[PDB]
Amino acid sequence: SINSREVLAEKVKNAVNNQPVTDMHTHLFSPNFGEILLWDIDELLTYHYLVAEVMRWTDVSIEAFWAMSKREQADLIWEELFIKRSPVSEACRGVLTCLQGLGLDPATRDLQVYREYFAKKTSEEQVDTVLQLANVSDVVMTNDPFDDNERISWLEGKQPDSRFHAALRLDPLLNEYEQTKHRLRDWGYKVNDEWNEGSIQEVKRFLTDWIERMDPVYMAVSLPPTFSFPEESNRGRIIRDCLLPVAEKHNIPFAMMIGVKKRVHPALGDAGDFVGKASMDGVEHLLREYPNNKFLVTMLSRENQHELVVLARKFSNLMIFGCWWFMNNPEIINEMTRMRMEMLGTSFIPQHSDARVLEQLIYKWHHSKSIIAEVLIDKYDDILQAGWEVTEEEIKRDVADLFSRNFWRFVGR
Amino acid sequence: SINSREVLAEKVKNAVNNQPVTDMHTHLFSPNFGEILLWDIDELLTYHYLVAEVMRWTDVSIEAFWAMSKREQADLIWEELFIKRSPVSEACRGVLTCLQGLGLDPATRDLQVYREYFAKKTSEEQVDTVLQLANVSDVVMTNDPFDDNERISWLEGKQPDSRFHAALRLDPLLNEYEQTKHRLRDWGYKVNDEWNEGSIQEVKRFLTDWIERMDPVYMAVSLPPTFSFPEESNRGRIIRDCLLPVAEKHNIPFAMMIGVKKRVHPALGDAGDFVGKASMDGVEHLLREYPNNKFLVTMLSRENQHELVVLARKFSNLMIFGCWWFMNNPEIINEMTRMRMEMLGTSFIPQHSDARVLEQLIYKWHHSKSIIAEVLIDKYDDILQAGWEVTEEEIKRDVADLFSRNFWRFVGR
Ligand SMILES: O=C[C@H](O)[C@@H](O)[C@H](O)[C@H](O)C(=O)O
Ligand SMILES: O=C[C@H](O)[C@@H](O)[C@H](O)[C@H](O)C(=O)O
Ligand SMILES: [Zn+2]
Ligand SMILES: [Zn+2]
Fold first, then answer.
1. Are residues A14 and A107 in the same domain?
2. Which residues line the pocket of ligand 1, CB cutoff 6 A?
């Protein structure tokens, strides 16, 4: 039986380590979609998190950086962030965890040798390897139909294998309708100059056509710190007249990733986004006024985290998830996961990888699981010491909810 | 390939229940038009059908009734027609069907709890709820340009959403021209004292102006039992020289609801109209003499129903529809629907709801569909007995024709 923190620690760590993970938000693609799925050490080293970091150290111009080849970029970052300075940051640590996880030894710092490993392997094989090592059963993608490369694949019949699931990303439609409406009409969606019945129906038709083609687990959008709802704006009316009705009809949840301030430093590309605290008014209104709609929410500002948890206490149709981006750091992952558990028990989704490069699934889940395991150990021990019987079976059940079941139960699949 | 009677009944009922309905005559309005759209339990209980019925029981004078507030009128009707006597009449049965459909429970007879349901929703939300429950996809309104409230609404650009369609009601123009002509000139339509070229072209202009503003699926008028045509009167002349030619040009059907005798009991208001049998001469003449015009007809007298069916056998430019008002009772709906199918096959429109209160769509259609399903089952079964085997697809086709396709195909939309 489990009758001590010591015994508990072992059981929790084992259960957490063995629980197959459903990664509900990533930037990975089923291997059959082609090169859009990024992988290998050079891709790991050029993750935009490391681009931002290297630029704080290197005298190499950002324009010169983008001009270099992928290998040149990787060599520079490795040299600047691993050799000239110890790789102690979270993103650098992550690269190391991946290498070790694949059987490569960071002790040698032999980059040329690490590279050879990847060269003698295919995309399909590396996917098998990584999913096995990271113990990830299901990966949810981010599918942007407004991206020409991504859109052509779906239109031409490309479909993910069983391990990969689609999520209809809609940032251009909701946040740039003034420019995006012209593309809809180019694709046959007769949206008019004014927001009338015709415009509302065509936008709904656009969403329905893409839902049928992708069979998404949810529709998503990243939003700025200034997000508000209700709102007399293109976004406010599209959400009110089109997105919500369609989502309820198909019982598809609406995922909102709030707090991103896009391109405060354009020259840095994907690495040029900032953060800002948002008002909870919009989320609060959406949850209260649309009780038949489901909402998946994650916020970027550290200062929004505690109140988001309290908001989940208020509305069952709100399912909070992950420690997103700038929140995806040990210090923050820990505080967020503890506040969440203390006020929500196990009724939340503690994490997602947001993996942009295949191998990251290894470090993202290993770094997170160790922290989540420690929180669970503290929480289980507190009730154990209080006289409660905790069985290994109940631990596996709870761990399964946190890393997989809660999501699937919420999406309705 | 259906050969057993049980499967046949099963497929017919499923097809009827699943078939999205086009309700081609109601007194409902798109929710954006305002409070003109009536809804909720108090509105249901004060429907004029129940006003007439409660007066046969209550000692409360009609004057006092009208003096009462809406909620007080509802309480009296509830007490008098539901508590003091079993609510077995069709209208009272309808209110119950509505409450049950909404998820409310008639068993408790808790009127206050029922009211609480409506109080927590908006008109927009309730229309969404009711259109779904009643599986009604299209509602045809009754739009009267002679009503100040309605007119100004159409003048200020108000447009119904895609679920609602307009029908240009002309009772004041055709039945009260003498008093109405002064309003036509007040609006810039210079009709002359006598019926000449100018008076004819200005009346046409009025019609055309409103057809362009409403884009009605048809033009309508309710007529008395004494209706005649040809006829040297304002109605006879306006119809001959204006209505018909204008209707033919725009290929717009002319709907005539014949048989009502207005205000035989003035104090009852909307619940004070009576019925009388009409001559078929006028309708016979119109169909034969104006073959390029389309006519939608429904009559109020039980005694007019059989010959109307026969008239439809004579003229393809006649499309009979629904079981109107005093005909909208199970006993009459059943005999009417059977006489119609027996002499016209599927070439007619069996029903319309005539809803004045939103929630009525639930009971109007539920009560009618069960009866129409019964008739279909019997007729399909009769040919099955002869050796004919229908396919489930042919059934869905026939059902679609009756509840929606016959109307749109007839109006040409
Ligand atoms: O976590 C960081 C991501 O890789 C971002 O670059 C991304 O834009 C963000 O997660 C999003 O999906 O909107
Ligand atoms: O069913 C009865 C209606 O509510 C009547 O009051 C209405 O005047 C009639 O249907 C009409 O449109 O002439
Ligand atoms: Zn992301
Ligand atoms: Zn009517």
1. no
2. A 27, 142, 222, 257, 270, 325, 354, 356
